[PDB]
Ligand SMILES: *[C@@H]1O[C@H](CO)[C@@H](O[C@@H]2O[C@H](CO)[C@@H](O[C@@H]3O[C@H](CO)[C@@H](O)[C@H](O)[C@@H]3O)[C@H](O)[C@H]2NC(C)=O)[C@H](O)[C@H]1NC(C)=O
């Protein structure tokens with residue numbers, strides 16, 4: 001079943017019906033005995049409870065953003081730095 | 084063994100108020116520090132609550148319609164309300180499910196029961212234990228069976244205040260029967276008081292049967308029959324819009340109807356419990 005634990009790496013998890021990708025990490029949210037998973041102020045399933053160990057974990061987004069290139073110009077140099 | 088009673092008073096249909104009860108956890112999903120709209124079956128605030136009182140010569144449990152899903156409350160000190168039959172025809176012609184507490188187990192059983200017209204437990208009033216299980220005469224084509232853990236329940240008749248307030252909601256959707264539970268301690272004589280308690284889901288039972296009516300299974304206290312003071316309260320649900328309030332500990336702390344007045348419906352739109360002065364726009368007429 002490969003019910004392992006990979007913390008702090010972007011993986012593509014699949015719980016008991018809970019699919020998706022992201023970086024996994026331990027949570028500290030106050031559940032109930034009948035909670036299974038929680039959601040944020042948005043409509044994303046944020047936190048998760050282990051079907052195997054009943055551990056409260058929260059799910060973070062993997063990685064994204066924009067790229068901006070920094071140049072001093074062509075007639076002087078050619079090296080650049082990123083952001 | 085089907086035993087009907089001799090001198091039962093006709094039912095009261097005495098109406099009471101629904102003030103702020105009927106709150107349940109709608110799902111299994113955690114939220115916190117938030118407000119949240121729902122469109123689901125609910126008891127509206129401050130509504131007609133039919134109180135069926137079991138008093139000295141009054142044994143009220145007729146055939147009661149489930150029509151849309153029901154709200155139930157039980158004002159208890161001696162555990163008179165112990166079970167229910169759910170179904171449509173309330174005979175052995177259609178499948179009936181019976182969920183009882185027989186003072187040993189929570190027993191769930193769905194068969195074609197030959198319904199006794201008067202379901203009750205008989206309890207010896209000077210002895211203090213259950214004597215009879217006069218529920219059903221026959222049972223066949225049993226679809227579902229459940230018997231819970233063995234536990235010792237308080238059966239004998241008590242005196243004084245109603246101490247125990249058990250609130251139940253039953254909800255047929257997608258072939259299930261959603262079963263809701265909640266309890267608070269009380270102390271009152273009659274007339275189910277105001278309060279605010281979120282009910283908790285306990286069972287989502289794949290029955291798949293036509294349930295239109297029901298009848299509670301009460302407990303006769305006998306020195307054939309005799310009764311003691313107990314009351315149970317009839318509530319229908321209606322598809323409403325409420326808004327919940329989650330704290331930092333994920334507790335439902337406040338609820339608000341969007342339908343009782345233009346005031347609270349505005350509070351559903353503005354999404355705060357407090358609004359200062361001014362004029363605000365809501366939907367069309
Ligand atoms: C959410 O729930 C938790 C737990 O129910 C609340 O935290 C609790 O806060 C109380 C008082 O603020 C703490 O009680 C204190 O305990 C110490 C040590 O026993 C005692 O000396 C004090 O006199 C007082 O009784 C309690 O320990 C604490 N529990 C935990 C687990 O933190 C919390 O306040 C709740 N938050 C909200 C927003 O409802």
Ligand SMILES: *[C@@H]1O[C@H](CO)[C@@H](O)[C@H](O)[C@H]1NC(C)=O
Nearest residue numbers: 071072073074075076077078
């Ligand atoms: C390079 O171009 C900049 C303007 O983009 C100018 O100010 C600078 O004098 C130029 N340098 C040379 C060596 O042409």
Ligand SMILES: *[C@@H]1O[C@H](CO)[C@@H](O)[C@H](O)[C@H]1NC(C)=O
Nearest residue numbers: 096097098099129130131132
């Ligand atoms: C039902 O409730 C309404 C208030 O919504 C009240 O005016 C009416 O008298 C109640 N009916 C009975 C039979 O008590």
